[PDB]
Amino acid sequence: KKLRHLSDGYWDSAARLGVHGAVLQAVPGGRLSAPDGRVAVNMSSYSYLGLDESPRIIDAAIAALRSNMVLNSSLGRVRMTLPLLEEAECALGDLFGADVATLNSCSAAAWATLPVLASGLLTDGVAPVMVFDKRAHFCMASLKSLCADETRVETIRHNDVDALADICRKNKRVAYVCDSVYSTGGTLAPLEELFALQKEFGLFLYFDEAHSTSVIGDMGRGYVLDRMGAINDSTMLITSLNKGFGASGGAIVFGPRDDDRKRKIIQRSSGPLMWSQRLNTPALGAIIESAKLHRSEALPELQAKLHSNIALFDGLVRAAGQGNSVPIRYLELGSEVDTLEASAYLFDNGFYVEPDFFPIVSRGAAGLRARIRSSMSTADIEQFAHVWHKLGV
Amino acid sequence: RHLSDGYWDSAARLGVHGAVLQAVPGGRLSAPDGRVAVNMSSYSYLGLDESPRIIDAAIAALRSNMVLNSSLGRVRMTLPLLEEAECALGDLFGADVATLNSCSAAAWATLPVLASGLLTDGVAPVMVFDKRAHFCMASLKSLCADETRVETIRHNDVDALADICRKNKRVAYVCDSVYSTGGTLAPLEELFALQKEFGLFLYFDEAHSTSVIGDMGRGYVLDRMGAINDSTMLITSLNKGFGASGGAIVFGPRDDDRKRKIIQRSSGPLMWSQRLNTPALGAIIESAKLHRSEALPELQAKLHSNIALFDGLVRAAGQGNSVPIRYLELGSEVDTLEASAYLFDNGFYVEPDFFPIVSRGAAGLRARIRSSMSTADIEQFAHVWHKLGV
Ligand SMILES: *Cc1c(COP(=O)(O)O)cnc(C)c1O
Ligand SMILES: *Cc1c(COP(=O)(O)O)cnc(C)c1O
């Protein structure tokens, strides 16, 4: 309706204040430059382990492109793949202990997998009831209508395991579509309950891991796999590989490494995994190098640095999430106009913090979405806390 | 389906599906055993996937920026490289252009909002899909159906489309510019006549038309239309002939930012899905420079001569087209798989299309002509293919 006038004004206002839609150059040190030349620390980068600045990863991307001398990793888009692609998927498979396919985005992964899960081909031919968590990322939830073409679709309230329990008792086959780590709300998927229902009813678990992989778990295998240990044949993960894994694209984690069936079924479906371009060679080079990194001691070190930085920030600034180990923080200011001016003020003083405003969030619930990363120094956070408290005076 | 999957297994077992080959210069593939073959099914129509200018620009962009992401750790900001790439494509097509990580993502970000009427003055149009619209759009009908009426008409049936225009206040027609199966083209003269008469909104997937067709390679629709109007939208893939990576929305005229802002502010992949990395954007910039230089008409001349050469030596569905796509119908899926297996051993990969890719009993090899084929390449192929009749 006419809230569209309201939302457009916020977008228009964000752009006018320079807190949205600016052209900034990536500066070493989690920093952003500007045409004027001013530098700002990026307090909202999604590269949670700072791997976007890894010389190791960038040089493997350059090497892969230079030694294959082709961008595309298909052979001119025919149904054949470069050795580089098989190596990258083998590398992701070793890391995750699972059969893994790459795609050009996590969103493509969801498009390739959800309508298949809905049809029944992944669950012994029984079309499951597709149960969507209300807070599931839009790359999944915007596809309910394709799922509806295949089966009954339900949406439950956030983490309502009891309603899920009911649906399981009422139907032969059920699937649960959710995020591992929700970026707003600070919540997590209820893994203990979900695994109990999967044990009791054979519930299919489908997790979007984009904010989980790298930041959580041994070797950054992520929230689900850390608790789970070895994936089973009733659990599927999609994830993005350019938020902290430090490369490009997304990925499907089909299930166990020694079972080709789910990959075969999904590869032979009509979806992006069949007819949408594979990752280019620099991206695949970067995934291989990051996979090695994730298996090295580099990874627990970066995770120690990250939790160190979370503790620092939480000790100096109060924000929703304070005390979590998910490096996402919400500085709620309520007023869309205040959030915007706070964002503009902080940028002028060396710190970019992205403003969330309606439609992105509820009306009267606007605020600054900060993200903690390994590549923040102790100076960066302490000086940010100093500028943030000076604004409150 | 089990038969189709049974066909998939043989294809893989024969080594004509799902094998691992290395790219070899000259449009070639090297197997593990050193067997080198000519790829007769590559989609790099102008040979630009072997352009050393483009490949170096890709390397250069990655080394100057020292990051992969073209966002700033995915905040709602962009590297100068991304703006330069979208301005390069804006100069080339004479239109407001956004990049995306794929043409599929371009369809996902645009078709729901077009269905909603946000792009047609608040009036939800009737969404009419050509029968042969590519899957990346056709598989999104249900999302369109949540916003308005969806219709699928017979392929290129401009009369059924005209009946719809007369019976509804606003209609949008979703189709391909160039169809890869059937060799057909979008009836541009009819479609534009309906648009001038009814305000029909035209949505073109230009994936097989970018670079191949048109002065400077602006594609089929823009070469005839000249300048894009406010009722015409394009989506295209940039890794098929353009020689780069990703895909792009062609919103409309360069001077109107309203469709871009509406799309960007909508809940879709253009907002929430990662932008192209820096080597791809560098490639896009360099290839755009190439598409405005004299190298593009030269490569197109080379392509048409290869099509003519092929058409004279080999009888194939499409023969006579100016579209570099040909189908060697063999009917039997097994004959198609054996013929593919045979040609690859004698130096030529042609991909086999079997059920479910195509109908039962309409299996065949799908050849594509590119600028990077030599005369010798095509002459030798026609011989090995004619010898197979023996
Ligand atoms: C290649 C193709 C697509 C998909 O392109 P991607 O960029 O790989 O997602 C869409 N439409 C047509 C006609 C295509 O040929
Ligand atoms: C990052 C994000 C996505 C989108 O990932 P892309 O790789 O850009 O398609 C999907 N789900 C969640 C939870 C995300 O955070």
PDB file of N, CA and C and ligand atoms in Angstrom, chain A residues 77 104 275-277, chain B residues 43 102-105 134 136 176 178 205 207-208 237-240 246-247, ligand 1:
ATOM      1  N   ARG A  77      30.399 -24.219 -21.498  1.00  0.00           N
ATOM      2  CA  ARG A  77      29.058 -24.505 -20.985  1.00  0.00           C
ATOM      3  C   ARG A  77      28.529 -25.864 -21.418  1.00  0.00           C
ATOM      4  N   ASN A 104      26.981 -20.681  -8.338  1.00  0.00           N
ATOM      5  CA  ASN A 104      27.356 -19.275  -8.409  1.00  0.00           C
ATOM      6  C   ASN A 104      26.823 -18.454  -7.232  1.00  0.00           C
ATOM      7  N   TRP A 275      21.215 -25.760 -15.576  1.00  0.00           N
ATOM      8  CA  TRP A 275      21.268 -24.780 -16.660  1.00  0.00           C
ATOM      9  C   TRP A 275      21.784 -23.397 -16.251  1.00  0.00           C
ATOM     10  N   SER A 276      22.418 -23.255 -15.093  1.00  0.00           N
ATOM     11  CA  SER A 276      22.988 -21.975 -14.702  1.00  0.00           C
ATOM     12  C   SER A 276      24.494 -22.112 -14.563  1.00  0.00           C
ATOM     13  N   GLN A 277      25.214 -21.060 -14.972  1.00  0.00           N
ATOM     14  CA  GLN A 277      26.669 -21.114 -15.107  1.00  0.00           C
ATOM     15  C   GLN A 277      27.360 -21.580 -13.825  1.00  0.00           C
TER      16      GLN A 277
ATOM     17  N   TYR B  43      29.551 -22.771 -26.120  1.00  0.00           N
ATOM     18  CA  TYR B  43      28.660 -21.624 -26.223  1.00  0.00           C
ATOM     19  C   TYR B  43      29.401 -20.304 -26.390  1.00  0.00           C
ATOM     20  N   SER B 102      24.279 -14.146 -12.363  1.00  0.00           N
ATOM     21  CA  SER B 102      23.799 -15.033 -13.418  1.00  0.00           C
ATOM     22  C   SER B 102      22.590 -14.405 -14.102  1.00  0.00           C
ATOM     23  N   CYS B 103      22.267 -14.929 -15.289  1.00  0.00           N
ATOM     24  CA  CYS B 103      21.020 -14.549 -15.948  1.00  0.00           C
ATOM     25  C   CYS B 103      19.820 -15.116 -15.197  1.00  0.00           C
ATOM     26  N   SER B 104      19.962 -16.326 -14.637  1.00  0.00           N
ATOM     27  CA  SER B 104      18.932 -16.890 -13.762  1.00  0.00           C
ATOM     28  C   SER B 104      18.555 -15.934 -12.629  1.00  0.00           C
ATOM     29  N   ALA B 105      19.560 -15.388 -11.927  1.00  0.00           N
ATOM     30  CA  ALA B 105      19.284 -14.421 -10.865  1.00  0.00           C
ATOM     31  C   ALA B 105      18.597 -13.185 -11.430  1.00  0.00           C
ATOM     32  N   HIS B 134      12.786 -20.091 -21.758  1.00  0.00           N
ATOM     33  CA  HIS B 134      13.805 -20.812 -21.008  1.00  0.00           C
ATOM     34  C   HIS B 134      13.351 -21.065 -19.569  1.00  0.00           C
ATOM     35  N   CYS B 136      14.715 -20.775 -16.694  1.00  0.00           N
ATOM     36  CA  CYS B 136      15.029 -19.818 -15.631  1.00  0.00           C
ATOM     37  C   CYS B 136      13.902 -18.819 -15.419  1.00  0.00           C
ATOM     38  N   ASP B 176      12.040 -15.743 -25.238  1.00  0.00           N
ATOM     39  CA  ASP B 176      13.430 -15.655 -25.677  1.00  0.00           C
ATOM     40  C   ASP B 176      13.536 -14.824 -26.952  1.00  0.00           C
ATOM     41  N   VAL B 178      16.229 -15.407 -29.051  1.00  0.00           N
ATOM     42  CA  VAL B 178      16.684 -16.490 -29.892  1.00  0.00           C
ATOM     43  C   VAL B 178      16.437 -17.770 -29.111  1.00  0.00           C
ATOM     44  N   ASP B 205      14.583 -12.670 -22.961  1.00  0.00           N
ATOM     45  CA  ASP B 205      15.814 -13.374 -22.599  1.00  0.00           C
ATOM     46  C   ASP B 205      16.712 -13.404 -23.831  1.00  0.00           C
ATOM     47  N   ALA B 207      20.023 -14.359 -24.045  1.00  0.00           N
ATOM     48  CA  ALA B 207      21.256 -15.095 -23.767  1.00  0.00           C
ATOM     49  C   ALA B 207      21.958 -15.563 -25.038  1.00  0.00           C
ATOM     50  N   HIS B 208      21.207 -16.050 -26.026  1.00  0.00           N
ATOM     51  CA  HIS B 208      21.809 -16.544 -27.265  1.00  0.00           C
ATOM     52  C   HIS B 208      21.894 -15.470 -28.327  1.00  0.00           C
ATOM     53  N   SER B 237      22.682 -13.581 -20.267  1.00  0.00           N
ATOM     54  CA  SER B 237      23.865 -14.170 -19.669  1.00  0.00           C
ATOM     55  C   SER B 237      25.105 -13.615 -20.360  1.00  0.00           C
ATOM     56  N   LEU B 238      26.162 -13.381 -19.583  1.00  0.00           N
ATOM     57  CA  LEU B 238      27.352 -12.720 -20.093  1.00  0.00           C
ATOM     58  C   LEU B 238      28.518 -13.678 -20.255  1.00  0.00           C
ATOM     59  N   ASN B 239      28.291 -14.980 -20.087  1.00  0.00           N
ATOM     60  CA  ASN B 239      29.373 -15.945 -20.209  1.00  0.00           C
ATOM     61  C   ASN B 239      29.199 -16.863 -21.414  1.00  0.00           C
ATOM     62  N   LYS B 240      28.436 -16.400 -22.458  1.00  0.00           N
ATOM     63  CA  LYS B 240      28.058 -17.170 -23.680  1.00  0.00           C
ATOM     64  C   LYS B 240      28.252 -16.321 -24.929  1.00  0.00           C
ATOM     65  N   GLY B 246      28.754 -13.925 -15.253  1.00  0.00           N
ATOM     66  CA  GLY B 246      27.546 -13.331 -14.699  1.00  0.00           C
ATOM     67  C   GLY B 246      26.455 -13.109 -15.737  1.00  0.00           C
ATOM     68  N   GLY B 247      25.598 -12.131 -15.426  1.00  0.00           N
ATOM     69  CA  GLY B 247      24.426 -11.836 -16.227  1.00  0.00           C
ATOM     70  C   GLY B 247      23.985 -10.405 -15.953  1.00  0.00           C
TER      71      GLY B 247
HETATM   72  C1  LIG C   1      22.246 -19.670 -20.454  1.00  0.00           C
HETATM   73  C2  LIG C   1      20.777 -19.383 -20.422  1.00  0.00           C
HETATM   74  C3  LIG C   1      20.213 -18.887 -19.270  1.00  0.00           C
HETATM   75  C4  LIG C   1      20.899 -19.010 -17.915  1.00  0.00           C
HETATM   76  O1  LIG C   1      22.090 -18.258 -17.876  1.00  0.00           O
HETATM   77  P1  LIG C   1      22.991 -18.247 -16.558  1.00  0.00           P
HETATM   78  O2  LIG C   1      23.710 -16.922 -16.651  1.00  0.00           O
HETATM   79  O3  LIG C   1      23.956 -19.410 -16.540  1.00  0.00           O
HETATM   80  O4  LIG C   1      22.099 -18.356 -15.336  1.00  0.00           O
HETATM   81  C5  LIG C   1      18.959 -18.270 -19.326  1.00  0.00           C
HETATM   82  N1  LIG C   1      18.288 -18.125 -20.504  1.00  0.00           N
HETATM   83  C6  LIG C   1      18.852 -18.642 -21.643  1.00  0.00           C
HETATM   84  C7  LIG C   1      18.158 -18.529 -22.955  1.00  0.00           C
HETATM   85  C8  LIG C   1      20.075 -19.252 -21.602  1.00  0.00           C
HETATM   86  O5  LIG C   1      20.585 -19.685 -22.787  1.00  0.00           O
END
